[PDB]
Amino acid sequence: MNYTILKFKTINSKNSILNVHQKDVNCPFEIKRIFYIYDFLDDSIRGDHANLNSEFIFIALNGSCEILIDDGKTKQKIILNNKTKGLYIDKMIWKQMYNFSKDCILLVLTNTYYDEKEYIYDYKYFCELKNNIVW
Amino acid sequence: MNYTILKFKTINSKNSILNVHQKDVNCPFEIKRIFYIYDFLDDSIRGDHANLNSEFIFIALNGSCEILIDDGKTKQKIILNNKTKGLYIDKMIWKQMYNFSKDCILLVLTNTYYDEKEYIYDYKYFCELKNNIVWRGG
Ligand SMILES: Cc1cn([C@H]2C[C@H](O)[C@@H](COP(=O)(O)OP(=O)(O)O)O2)c(=O)[nH]c1=O
Ligand SMILES: Cc1cn([C@H]2C[C@H](O)[C@@H](COP(=O)(O)OP(=O)(O)O)O2)c(=O)[nH]c1=O
């Protein structure tokens, strides 16, 4: 599956630490949209979809969570809990996020404007799209 | 001086809160780069420059800090301390940030790639370039 764990370069100066993201700097794509997710309750789950076009980098900026990614062929669990690590996934990877700490802040970077129409919410279709050897 | 304290529209769902930023959603520019600053020790200070092209939104995702902004003629101090608000500033505004809490995480959105040639680190010449721009009609 087309995922990587990225290790960010930081700039340690002025008694603090700076992490930069842009095309070719701790990010393989061109950024167009950012969002962050916070104030999680005990059984919060996010995701349950794949996206046709958007690539993602997920970064836990505070606290931590889990993510299960799935390409139709294999699955992986990933822990995010570190400001110098990110999970990069290509488009057409199903994901769910859960087991959020109380204090988790999740930052997501993507290369597309939000488009409800690029979403795949039906898992069987997703798996047909990833595996069906006719097409 | 051109700045705005934004109140963000949040999406409250799935037992959590989502804040989205892109052109015309909680941000007036096209995003091209993001950065965040953290692990501040007591006396830490950031900024001390102006930028010729870039606009910015500053958000305290966690904790709090104070920002001073300066148009060459006046200055203004603002506290950043929660996730539903940020400070938009236009280009060619000088800024300095200080009084960071130990747990402060500062997130910044901007509309450009990083460019050393866009920085003005000398306040005196900041005021001259800005006074000239203002003089021109800007
Ligand atoms: C990610 C995102 C979501 N939303 C809205 C639409 C969705 O109904 C809701 C949550 O998005 P969605 O991606 O469906 O949930 P998750 O973040 O768990 O994957 O917020 C936007 O308006 N813009 C966005 O960029
Ligand atoms: C913001 C930023 C800084 N840097 C480098 C250049 C600077 O010497 C240093 C700090 O940036 P600078 O903007 O000069 O300081 P501050 O963050 O306090 O305003 O890190 C980058 O390489 N890319 C970036 O996007």
Side-chain angles (χ1 to χ4, degrees), chain A residues 11 13-14 18 20-22 25, chain B residues 33-35 37 45-49 51 95 97 113-115 119 121:
Chain A
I11 298 165
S13 73
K14 302 192 194 179
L18 166 71
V20 176
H21 304 268
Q22 60 172 57
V25 182
Chain B
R33 158 170 64 129
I34 243 78
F35 50 94
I37 312 179
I45 290 166
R46 313 282 312 202
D48 293 310
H49 55 84
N51 299 69
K95 92 287 301 181
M97 305 169 263
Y113 299 131
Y114 169 69
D115 184 2
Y119 279 73
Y121 288 112

mmCIF file of all heavy atoms in Angstrom, chain A residues 11 13-14 18 20-22 25, chain B residues 33-35 37 45-49 51 95 97 113-115 119 121, ligand 2:
data_model
loop_
_atom_site.group_PDB
_atom_site.id
_atom_site.type_symbol
_atom_site.label_atom_id
_atom_site.label_comp_id
_atom_site.label_asym_id
_atom_site.label_seq_id
_atom_site.Cartn_x
_atom_site.Cartn_y
_atom_site.Cartn_z
ATOM 1 N N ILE A 11 13.368 23.106 12.785
ATOM 2 C CA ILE A 11 14.322 24.179 12.902
ATOM 3 C C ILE A 11 14.310 24.595 14.354
ATOM 4 O O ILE A 11 13.330 25.185 14.857
ATOM 5 C CB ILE A 11 13.940 25.318 11.972
ATOM 6 C CG1 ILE A 11 13.985 24.802 10.534
ATOM 7 C CG2 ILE A 11 14.964 26.428 12.153
ATOM 8 C CD1 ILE A 11 13.295 25.711 9.538
ATOM 9 N N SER A 13 15.506 26.905 16.993
ATOM 10 C CA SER A 13 16.087 28.245 17.216
ATOM 11 C C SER A 13 15.189 29.094 18.087
ATOM 12 O O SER A 13 14.074 28.692 18.402
ATOM 13 C CB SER A 13 16.355 28.990 15.927
ATOM 14 O OG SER A 13 15.167 29.446 15.307
ATOM 15 N N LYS A 14 15.698 30.239 18.523
ATOM 16 C CA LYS A 14 14.927 31.158 19.349
ATOM 17 C C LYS A 14 14.221 30.452 20.483
ATOM 18 O O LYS A 14 13.073 30.795 20.849
ATOM 19 C CB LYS A 14 13.892 31.880 18.475
ATOM 20 C CG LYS A 14 14.558 32.623 17.332
ATOM 21 C CD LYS A 14 13.551 33.547 16.703
ATOM 22 C CE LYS A 14 14.050 34.038 15.365
ATOM 23 N NZ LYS A 14 13.034 34.938 14.726
ATOM 24 N N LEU A 18 10.431 24.878 15.323
ATOM 25 C CA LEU A 18 9.612 25.245 14.185
ATOM 26 C C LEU A 18 9.570 24.103 13.203
ATOM 27 O O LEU A 18 10.616 23.575 12.792
ATOM 28 C CB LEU A 18 10.217 26.478 13.512
ATOM 29 C CG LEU A 18 9.703 26.836 12.101
ATOM 30 C CD1 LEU A 18 8.302 27.361 12.066
ATOM 31 C CD2 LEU A 18 10.561 27.974 11.558
ATOM 32 N N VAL A 20 7.942 23.141 9.429
ATOM 33 C CA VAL A 20 7.397 23.775 8.239
ATOM 34 C C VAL A 20 6.859 22.713 7.292
ATOM 35 O O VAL A 20 7.457 21.663 7.140
ATOM 36 C CB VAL A 20 8.506 24.541 7.506
ATOM 37 C CG1 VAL A 20 7.983 25.124 6.199
ATOM 38 C CG2 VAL A 20 8.962 25.661 8.405
ATOM 39 N N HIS A 21 5.703 22.969 6.695
ATOM 40 C CA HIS A 21 5.213 22.085 5.632
ATOM 41 C C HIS A 21 4.803 22.855 4.351
ATOM 42 O O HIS A 21 3.977 23.773 4.407
ATOM 43 C CB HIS A 21 4.032 21.213 6.151
ATOM 44 C CG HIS A 21 4.387 20.406 7.368
ATOM 45 N ND1 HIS A 21 4.872 19.122 7.311
ATOM 46 C CD2 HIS A 21 4.396 20.746 8.676
ATOM 47 C CE1 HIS A 21 5.121 18.692 8.535
ATOM 48 N NE2 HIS A 21 4.824 19.654 9.381
ATOM 49 N N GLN A 22 5.344 22.418 3.218
ATOM 50 C CA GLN A 22 4.943 22.946 1.922
ATOM 51 C C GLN A 22 5.433 21.935 0.930
ATOM 52 O O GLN A 22 6.209 21.070 1.251
ATOM 53 C CB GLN A 22 5.516 24.361 1.624
ATOM 54 C CG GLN A 22 7.042 24.414 1.615
ATOM 55 C CD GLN A 22 7.663 25.740 1.128
ATOM 56 O OE1 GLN A 22 7.404 26.825 1.644
ATOM 57 N NE2 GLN A 22 8.545 25.623 0.166
ATOM 58 N N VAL A 25 8.863 20.311 1.253
ATOM 59 C CA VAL A 25 9.401 20.490 2.591
ATOM 60 C C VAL A 25 8.445 19.783 3.592
ATOM 61 O O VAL A 25 7.408 20.327 3.926
ATOM 62 C CB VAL A 25 9.563 21.996 2.953
ATOM 63 C CG1 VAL A 25 10.175 22.169 4.344
ATOM 64 C CG2 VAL A 25 10.436 22.748 1.911
ATOM 65 N N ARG B 33 1.511 26.919 2.364
ATOM 66 C CA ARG B 33 2.418 26.494 3.403
ATOM 67 C C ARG B 33 1.807 26.719 4.788
ATOM 68 O O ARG B 33 1.085 27.718 5.042
ATOM 69 C CB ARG B 33 3.705 27.300 3.211
ATOM 70 C CG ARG B 33 4.588 27.426 4.441
ATOM 71 C CD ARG B 33 5.962 28.024 4.132
ATOM 72 N NE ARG B 33 5.762 29.387 3.672
ATOM 73 C CZ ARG B 33 6.380 30.477 4.135
ATOM 74 N NH1 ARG B 33 7.294 30.434 5.073
ATOM 75 N NH2 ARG B 33 6.065 31.638 3.625
ATOM 76 N N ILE B 34 2.172 25.826 5.707
ATOM 77 C CA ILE B 34 1.698 25.847 7.093
ATOM 78 C C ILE B 34 2.957 25.682 7.897
ATOM 79 O O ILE B 34 3.795 24.939 7.477
ATOM 80 C CB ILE B 34 0.761 24.596 7.307
ATOM 81 C CG1 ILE B 34 -0.551 25.175 7.606
ATOM 82 C CG2 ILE B 34 1.209 23.389 8.173
ATOM 83 C CD1 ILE B 34 -1.057 25.597 6.273
ATOM 84 N N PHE B 35 3.037 26.269 9.074
ATOM 85 C CA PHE B 35 4.055 25.872 10.024
ATOM 86 C C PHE B 35 3.550 26.034 11.436
ATOM 87 O O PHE B 35 2.568 26.704 11.703
ATOM 88 C CB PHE B 35 5.405 26.606 9.798
ATOM 89 C CG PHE B 35 5.290 28.085 9.681
ATOM 90 C CD1 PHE B 35 5.447 28.895 10.773
ATOM 91 C CD2 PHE B 35 5.020 28.685 8.452
ATOM 92 C CE1 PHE B 35 5.343 30.279 10.651
ATOM 93 C CE2 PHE B 35 4.944 30.068 8.328
ATOM 94 C CZ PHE B 35 5.122 30.879 9.424
ATOM 95 N N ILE B 37 4.937 26.126 15.710
ATOM 96 C CA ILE B 37 6.008 26.455 16.620
ATOM 97 C C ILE B 37 5.578 26.023 18.021
ATOM 98 O O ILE B 37 4.418 26.193 18.466
ATOM 99 C CB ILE B 37 6.297 27.960 16.578
ATOM 100 C CG1 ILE B 37 6.401 28.402 15.131
ATOM 101 C CG2 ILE B 37 7.640 28.255 17.228
ATOM 102 C CD1 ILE B 37 6.670 29.879 14.933
ATOM 103 N N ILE B 45 11.036 34.536 22.126
ATOM 104 C CA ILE B 45 10.442 35.555 21.276
ATOM 105 C C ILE B 45 10.536 35.159 19.800
ATOM 106 O O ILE B 45 11.592 34.722 19.348
ATOM 107 C CB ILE B 45 11.227 36.864 21.443
ATOM 108 C CG1 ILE B 45 10.972 37.437 22.833
ATOM 109 C CG2 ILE B 45 10.812 37.921 20.424
ATOM 110 C CD1 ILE B 45 11.966 38.518 23.192
ATOM 111 N N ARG B 46 9.447 35.290 19.037
ATOM 112 C CA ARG B 46 9.533 34.990 17.607
ATOM 113 C C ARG B 46 9.130 36.219 16.841
ATOM 114 O O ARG B 46 8.632 37.205 17.381
ATOM 115 C CB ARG B 46 8.624 33.833 17.165
ATOM 116 C CG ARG B 46 8.624 32.546 18.002
ATOM 117 C CD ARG B 46 9.802 31.643 17.770
ATOM 118 N NE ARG B 46 10.107 31.370 16.361
ATOM 119 C CZ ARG B 46 10.795 30.316 15.931
ATOM 120 N NH1 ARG B 46 11.289 29.399 16.747
ATOM 121 N NH2 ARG B 46 11.034 30.205 14.639
ATOM 122 N N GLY B 47 9.361 36.130 15.552
ATOM 123 C CA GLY B 47 9.103 37.212 14.632
ATOM 124 C C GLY B 47 10.278 38.171 14.565
ATOM 125 O O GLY B 47 11.393 37.774 14.238
ATOM 126 N N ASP B 48 9.999 39.449 14.798
ATOM 127 C CA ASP B 48 10.948 40.527 14.505
ATOM 128 C C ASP B 48 11.256 40.671 13.004
ATOM 129 O O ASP B 48 12.407 40.824 12.551
ATOM 130 C CB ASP B 48 12.214 40.369 15.369
ATOM 131 C CG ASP B 48 11.944 40.589 16.850
ATOM 132 O OD1 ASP B 48 11.320 41.618 17.185
ATOM 133 O OD2 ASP B 48 12.398 39.752 17.673
ATOM 134 N N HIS B 49 10.200 40.650 12.204
ATOM 135 C CA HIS B 49 10.366 40.938 10.791
ATOM 136 C C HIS B 49 9.013 41.208 10.159
ATOM 137 O O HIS B 49 7.976 40.905 10.718
ATOM 138 C CB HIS B 49 11.058 39.790 10.073
ATOM 139 C CG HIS B 49 10.365 38.471 10.250
ATOM 140 N ND1 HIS B 49 9.299 38.077 9.468
ATOM 141 C CD2 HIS B 49 10.559 37.470 11.147
ATOM 142 C CE1 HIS B 49 8.882 36.878 9.860
ATOM 143 N NE2 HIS B 49 9.640 36.482 10.872
ATOM 144 N N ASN B 51 7.076 40.872 6.148
ATOM 145 C CA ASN B 51 7.143 40.077 4.924
ATOM 146 C C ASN B 51 6.465 40.847 3.792
ATOM 147 O O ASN B 51 5.321 41.384 3.939
ATOM 148 C CB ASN B 51 6.518 38.672 5.101
ATOM 149 C CG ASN B 51 7.215 37.826 6.172
ATOM 150 O OD1 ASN B 51 7.142 38.115 7.380
ATOM 151 N ND2 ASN B 51 7.878 36.778 5.745
ATOM 152 N N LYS B 95 5.816 42.104 12.920
ATOM 153 C CA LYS B 95 5.271 41.378 14.060
ATOM 154 C C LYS B 95 6.353 40.811 14.952
ATOM 155 O O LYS B 95 7.442 40.485 14.496
ATOM 156 C CB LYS B 95 4.302 40.283 13.569
ATOM 157 C CG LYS B 95 4.869 38.901 13.321
ATOM 158 C CD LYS B 95 5.713 38.780 12.093
ATOM 159 C CE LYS B 95 4.978 39.143 10.825
ATOM 160 N NZ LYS B 95 5.933 38.946 9.723
ATOM 161 N N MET B 97 6.236 38.029 18.544
ATOM 162 C CA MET B 97 5.464 37.194 19.459
ATOM 163 C C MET B 97 6.227 36.765 20.662
ATOM 164 O O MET B 97 7.397 36.456 20.548
ATOM 165 C CB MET B 97 5.031 35.953 18.753
ATOM 166 C CG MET B 97 4.313 36.438 17.524
ATOM 167 S SD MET B 97 3.981 35.123 16.396
ATOM 168 C CE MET B 97 5.448 35.503 15.400
ATOM 169 N N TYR B 113 5.205 30.051 -0.766
ATOM 170 C CA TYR B 113 6.349 29.261 -0.409
ATOM 171 C C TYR B 113 7.360 30.060 0.419
ATOM 172 O O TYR B 113 7.426 31.258 0.275
ATOM 173 C CB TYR B 113 7.035 28.709 -1.661
ATOM 174 C CG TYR B 113 6.152 27.793 -2.518
ATOM 175 C CD1 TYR B 113 6.061 27.993 -3.890
ATOM 176 C CD2 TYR B 113 5.490 26.691 -1.975
ATOM 177 C CE1 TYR B 113 5.318 27.156 -4.675
ATOM 178 C CE2 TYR B 113 4.729 25.850 -2.743
ATOM 179 C CZ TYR B 113 4.639 26.106 -4.087
ATOM 180 O OH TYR B 113 3.898 25.297 -4.887
ATOM 181 N N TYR B 114 8.187 29.392 1.223
ATOM 182 C CA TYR B 114 9.174 30.097 2.015
ATOM 183 C C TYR B 114 10.134 30.856 1.093
ATOM 184 O O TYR B 114 10.565 30.311 0.100
ATOM 185 C CB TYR B 114 9.975 29.101 2.821
ATOM 186 C CG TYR B 114 11.157 29.734 3.457
ATOM 187 C CD1 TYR B 114 10.989 30.647 4.487
ATOM 188 C CD2 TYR B 114 12.457 29.440 3.010
ATOM 189 C CE1 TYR B 114 12.076 31.278 5.053
ATOM 190 C CE2 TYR B 114 13.553 30.082 3.550
ATOM 191 C CZ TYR B 114 13.354 30.987 4.569
ATOM 192 O OH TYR B 114 14.425 31.593 5.161
ATOM 193 N N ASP B 115 10.474 32.097 1.425
ATOM 194 C CA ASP B 115 11.358 32.887 0.572
ATOM 195 C C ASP B 115 12.106 33.905 1.418
ATOM 196 O O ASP B 115 11.532 34.917 1.896
ATOM 197 C CB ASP B 115 10.499 33.575 -0.443
ATOM 198 C CG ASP B 115 11.297 34.371 -1.480
ATOM 199 O OD1 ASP B 115 12.556 34.421 -1.504
ATOM 200 O OD2 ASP B 115 10.561 34.958 -2.276
ATOM 201 N N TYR B 119 11.765 38.800 3.279
ATOM 202 C CA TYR B 119 11.842 39.237 4.669
ATOM 203 C C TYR B 119 12.484 40.609 4.793
ATOM 204 O O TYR B 119 13.538 40.903 4.197
ATOM 205 C CB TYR B 119 12.765 38.291 5.462
ATOM 206 C CG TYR B 119 12.163 37.000 5.943
ATOM 207 C CD1 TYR B 119 11.874 35.953 5.065
ATOM 208 C CD2 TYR B 119 11.880 36.818 7.272
ATOM 209 C CE1 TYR B 119 11.350 34.762 5.524
ATOM 210 C CE2 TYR B 119 11.366 35.627 7.754
ATOM 211 C CZ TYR B 119 11.107 34.592 6.879
ATOM 212 O OH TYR B 119 10.637 33.410 7.397
ATOM 213 N N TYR B 121 14.041 42.388 7.957
ATOM 214 C CA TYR B 121 14.485 42.247 9.334
ATOM 215 C C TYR B 121 14.897 43.563 9.985
ATOM 216 O O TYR B 121 15.126 43.622 11.197
ATOM 217 C CB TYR B 121 15.703 41.329 9.364
ATOM 218 C CG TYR B 121 15.389 39.871 9.102
ATOM 219 C CD1 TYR B 121 15.807 39.221 7.936
ATOM 220 C CD2 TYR B 121 14.741 39.111 10.064
ATOM 221 C CE1 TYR B 121 15.566 37.851 7.733
ATOM 222 C CE2 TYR B 121 14.502 37.743 9.877
ATOM 223 C CZ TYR B 121 14.908 37.108 8.698
ATOM 224 O OH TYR B 121 14.623 35.740 8.521
HETATM 225 C C1 LIG C 2 8.939 30.261 8.572
HETATM 226 C C2 LIG C 2 10.136 29.529 8.024
HETATM 227 C C3 LIG C 2 11.388 29.688 8.600
HETATM 228 N N1 LIG C 2 12.433 29.025 8.092
HETATM 229 C C4 LIG C 2 13.755 29.190 8.696
HETATM 230 C C5 LIG C 2 14.344 30.533 8.287
HETATM 231 C C6 LIG C 2 14.568 31.301 9.575
HETATM 232 O O1 LIG C 2 15.957 31.610 9.726
HETATM 233 C C7 LIG C 2 14.111 30.392 10.705
HETATM 234 C C8 LIG C 2 12.996 31.039 11.517
HETATM 235 O O2 LIG C 2 12.099 31.716 10.639
HETATM 236 P P1 LIG C 2 11.780 33.281 10.844
HETATM 237 O O3 LIG C 2 10.438 33.575 10.218
HETATM 238 O O4 LIG C 2 12.996 34.070 10.424
HETATM 239 O O5 LIG C 2 11.628 33.402 12.443
HETATM 240 P P2 LIG C 2 10.171 33.395 13.128
HETATM 241 O O6 LIG C 2 9.666 31.992 12.894
HETATM 242 O O7 LIG C 2 10.449 33.723 14.575
HETATM 243 O O8 LIG C 2 9.411 34.464 12.380
HETATM 244 O O9 LIG C 2 13.640 29.175 10.122
HETATM 245 C C9 LIG C 2 12.277 28.168 6.978
HETATM 246 O O10 LIG C 2 13.273 27.563 6.527
HETATM 247 N N2 LIG C 2 11.082 27.991 6.397
HETATM 248 C C10 LIG C 2 9.999 28.624 6.857
HETATM 249 O O11 LIG C 2 8.888 28.456 6.312
#
